[PDB]
């Protein structure tokens, strides 16, 4: 099955601390090139390669380098990753280098990437669930939950919704992106809403469970730690509630 | 020089319609290609379609391409507009050696036809907690515009729109929440303009 992984997918790093970023595929493709996006504008290419031990620069390879040892394999190399070098990553990879019109050149999920001084400011989520409110449910006879999740920084997180322990899709929407809790601080935490609606009926069932998890992303046990506070390690927070019978 | 260039920041468009990007560039190369991609609000990114400089209109499903080679215009054509194309899309040029030049991009924003609106503002309770609470804006038509918040305080976030698939039913919703003392859904939303009708719950 076709598919393009990037190792991490989320990253915070210490300034000036080396790192790597792997991208692969197994579909045996010539070209693979790597990309980064700045919040609000396109893709700028940093490298590509036209296949194994091929290597040319693109628009900006500056603090960047890259090795093509083999086709699955075609590493990010950031000697010394500086504050301008967080942004949003991305590999591709093409069948061939001029793809013909039937095929396809397939994108990784992206890397965020995040260079900082130094991980102090680093906060996990708080989470909170908010029952649907009585008018809602006598007004439209639909019932709208509302999660939150507070307090964290960055805004490396994912949020999902699971009723009786399997995820869903229909009737969520979820905010494109975290807002600033203090805008003027750029180490300010970030906020994320979300809404679930179900009908009036299945909310007042008894039975049925509801559960917001937010999945955020961190540091790792090998980072070290000095603060007094818990370590923001990746961890999963989640809030929950049950119905009630009206 | 080598610029691509998409005039279009961000476009609304109802759902089912059509919808045309524009794209330009200028270059010094003369045999070249234009790659289209979609990046959903996920930020996952998606090859449309591939236009070749020496080949006739590419067009492939609810996409098509109007390759005007003068002017250097390659416009992209999408047919009969889905929820689910939302998003933001990218205009490409690349060359005979995977080398590749992007422009900046267009947020498309489809609009939902809304059959029987209702506004309301509800207040909704912790589960777990106390003083805690939200006010949900909601089942507005998407023609109203919900306003940032100018109080720096309260907390907004802009439109959302859900899909309860069992149902057929769409509806637009906003959230606003604050800590401060004596924050009332009422006086939410009052940097916004809200229906006259909307229905504020007297009990």
């Known amino acids: 099955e076709a598919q393009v992984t990037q190792n991490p997918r989320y990253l915070i790093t210490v300034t000036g601390k080396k790192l790597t970023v792997t991208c692969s595929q197994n579909?045996?493709?010539?070209?693979m090139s790597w990309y980064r996006q700045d919040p609000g504008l396109g893709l700028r290419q940093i490298y590509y390669?036209?296949?194994?031990?091929?290597?040319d620069k693109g628009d900006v390879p500056e603090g960047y380098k890259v090795s093509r040892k083999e086709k699955r394999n075609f590493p990010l190399i950031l000697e010394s990753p500086s504050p301008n070098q967080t942004s949003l990553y991305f590999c591709?990879?093409?069948?061939?280098?001029?793809?013909?019109?039937?095929?396809?050149?397939?994108f990784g999920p992206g890397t965020r990437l995040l260079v900082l001084e130094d991980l102090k400011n680093v906060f996990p989520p708080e989470v909170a669930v908010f029952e649907p409110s009585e008018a809602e449910i006598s007004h439209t006879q639909k019932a709208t939950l509302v999660c939150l999740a507070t307090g964290f920084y960055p805004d490396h997180v994912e949020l999902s919704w699971w009723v009786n322990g399997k995820e869903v899709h229909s009737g969520v929407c979820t905010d494109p992106q975290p807002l600033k809790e203090q805008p003027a601080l750029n180490d300010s935490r970030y906020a994320l809403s979300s809404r679930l609606r179900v009908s009036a009926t299945f909310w007042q069932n008894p039975r049925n469970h509801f559960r917001c998890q937010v999945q955020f992303y961190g540091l790792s046990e090998n980072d070290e730690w000095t603060q007094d506070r818990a370590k923001p390690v990746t961890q999963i927070v989640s809030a929950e509630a049950w119905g009630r019978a009206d | 020089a080598q610029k691509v260039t998409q005039a279009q920041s961000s476009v609304s468009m109802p759902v089912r319609k059509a919808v045309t990007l524009n794209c330009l560039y200028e270059t010094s190369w003369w045999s070249y290609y234009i790659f289209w991609y979609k990046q959903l609000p996920s930020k996952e990114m998606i090859f449309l379609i591939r236009?070749?400089?020496?080949?006739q209109n590419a067009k492939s499903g609810r996409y098509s391409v109007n390759f005007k080679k003068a002017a250097k215009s390659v416009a992209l054509t999408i047919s009969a507009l889905q929820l689910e194309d939302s998003a933001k899309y990218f205009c490409?040029?690349?060359?005979?050696?995977?080398?590749?030049?992007f422009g900046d991009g267009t947020t498309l924003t489809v609009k939902p036809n809304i059959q029987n609106p209702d506004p309301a503002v509800y207040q909704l309770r912790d589960s777990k907690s106390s003083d805690k609470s939200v006010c949900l804006f909601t089942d507005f038509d998407s023609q109203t515009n919900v306003s940032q918040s100018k109080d720096s305080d309260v907390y907004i976030t802009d439109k959302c729109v859900l899909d309860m698939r069992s149902m057929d039913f769409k509806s637009n919703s906003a959230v606003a929440w604050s800590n401060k003392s004596d924050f009332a859904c009422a006086n939410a939303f009052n940097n916004s303009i809200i229906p006259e009708d909307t229905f504020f719950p007297s009990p």
């Open positions: 591709a990879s093409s069948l061939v280098s001029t793809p013909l019109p039937k095929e396809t050149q397939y």
């Open positions: 579909m045996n493709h010539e070209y």
């Open positions: 390669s036209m296949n194994v031990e091929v290597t």
């Open positions: 236009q070749g400089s020496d080949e």
């Open positions: 490409a040029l690349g060359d005979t050696a995977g080398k590749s030049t």
